[PDB]
């Protein structure tokens, strides 16, 4: 587990968070639907609810 506590000497701000997250195009039998993007390995790496 990484612990990146906020430090004044670290000005390396992040912009990927500000930019909106991507989406995915998956088509089922009925129609083409749009779902939020998840990394192929994010299901077992996602932030756990528990």
């Amino acid at each position: 587990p990484l612990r990146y506590e906020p430090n004044n000497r670290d000005f390396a701000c992040n912009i990927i968070d500000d930019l909106p997250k991507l989406i995915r195009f998956v088509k089922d039998s009925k129609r083409i639907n749009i779902v939020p993007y998840t990394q192929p390995n994010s299901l077992w790496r996602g932030p756990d609810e528990d």
Binding site: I15, D17, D18, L19, P20
Partner: protein
């Protein structure tokens, strides 16, 4: 249009009095569709000359709230216009970068959804904002790609005719 001609010669104040009387005549006709044409012309004039935002009888924020919920049909290009004006105000207001990107996303998605070739004016304005937006972030690599699409000497209506020559001279 005479007000537009007045704005082309940088008269500015003389155009305001001429435009003001345009609103009164529109009410007498009692037709809704022409007011949107009037309202769109409002902020286009303020966008070129932001120093006159106080002189108008309607603040710029009032228009954005009206056009966003204007209708769901028979607008086509109104919403494409509506969201870009919010983006300029948000950029000027130095709002949070999360909101500016989201607002610009709204304008980029609606412009490219329909034909961008026919609406050459807004497509150029998209490029001008996006180059300016990303240049402000400090990423010239992204700005360069969009810069090759900004058209030169094309300029826009109601803003002089030698503005393109002057702008090229500044650089």
């Amino acid at each position: 249009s005479l007000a537009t001609f007045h704005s082309s010669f940088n008269e500015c104040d003389a155009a305001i009095n001429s435009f003001e009387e345009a609103t009164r005549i529109a009410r007498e006709n009692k037709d809704m569709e022409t007011l949107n044409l009037i309202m769109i012309w409002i902020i286009n004039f303020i966008e070129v000359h932001p120093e006159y935002a106080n002189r108008f009888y309607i603040t710029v924020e009032q228009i954005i709230k009206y056009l966003k919920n204007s209708s769901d049909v028979e607008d086509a290009n109104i919403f494409s216009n509506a969201y870009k004006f919010e983006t300029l105000l948000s950029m000027v207001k130095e709002s949070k970068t999360a909101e500016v990107s989201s607002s610009l996303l709204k304008f980029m998605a609606i412009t490219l959804q329909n034909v961008p070739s026919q609406n050459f004016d807004l497509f150029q304005s998209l490029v001008s904002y996006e180059v300016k937006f990303w240049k402000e972030l400090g990423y010239e690599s992204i700005s360069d790609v969009y810069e090759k699409f900004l058209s030169k000497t094309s300029s826009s209506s109601l803003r002089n005719y030698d503005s393109s020559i002057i702008n090229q001279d500044i650089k």
